[PDB]
Design a binder for these strands. Structure first.
Ligand code: ZN
Ligand code: ZN
Ligand code: ZN
Ligand code: ZN
Lengths: 88, 70
DNA sequence: TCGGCAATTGCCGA
DNA sequence: TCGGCAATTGCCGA
């Protein structure tokens, strides 16, 4: 894993890669926060949890209405188009 | 320096690390993405940033179809 | 384009 | 909680 939670790294112990929390964090009871590589910022793993859920809903919904896969802005393969400040 | 992109890592050359797509790739206009060491698949310099982006557009579309926060 | 070494890391064991 | 070495990875430089 290149993901190991702000806790774990500190303690220097082996971060348990699950969402919305790595094993120790849980037990030890705490908030599981990942330091985002690029942006460098904190990211509670759960925040991603839910945010992931939200696509989920969104995908049922928008699919129901007769839709699927969307054009974006930040992006995934070396084959999408790139970002530009403000504009799409 | 915390994480250098697909293109630079393979080019083996210094990556200015900028959000959301480092200048080197910006300049040239080649999409700038990160790369999953485990899978080898292309993957965005920033997951939450990608998600937050994704839902937005999902939302806007949903709005033009009448809906919401479902 | 890349050899190859600096610097980071994950995380073991104490 | 750390020393601390293994893996990993940034990136000079030619
Ligand atoms: Zn952890
Ligand atoms: Zn954690
Ligand atoms: Zn780059
Ligand atoms: Zn780039």
């Amino acid at each position: 894993s290149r993901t190991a939670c702000k806790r774990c790294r500190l303690k220097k112990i082996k971060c348990d890669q699950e969402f919305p929390s790595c094993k120790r964090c849980a037990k030890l009871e705490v908030p599981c926060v990942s330091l985002d590589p690029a942006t460098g910022k904190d990211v509670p793993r759960s925040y991603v949890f839910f945010l992931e859920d939200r696509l989920a809903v969104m995908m049922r919904v928008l699919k129901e209405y007769g839709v699927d896969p969307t054009k974006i802005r930040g992006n995934i393969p070396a084959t999408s188009d790139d970002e530009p400040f403000d504009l799409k | 320096s915390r994480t250098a992109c697909k293109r630079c890592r393979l080019k083996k050359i210094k990556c200015d690390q900028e959000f959301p797509s480092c200048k080197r790739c910006a300049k040239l206009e080649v999409p700038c993405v990160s790369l999953d060491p485990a899978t080898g698949k292309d993957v965005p310099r920033s997951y939450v940033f990608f998600l937050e982006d994704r839902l937005a557009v999902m939302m806007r579309v949903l709005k033009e179809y009448g809906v919401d926060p479902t």
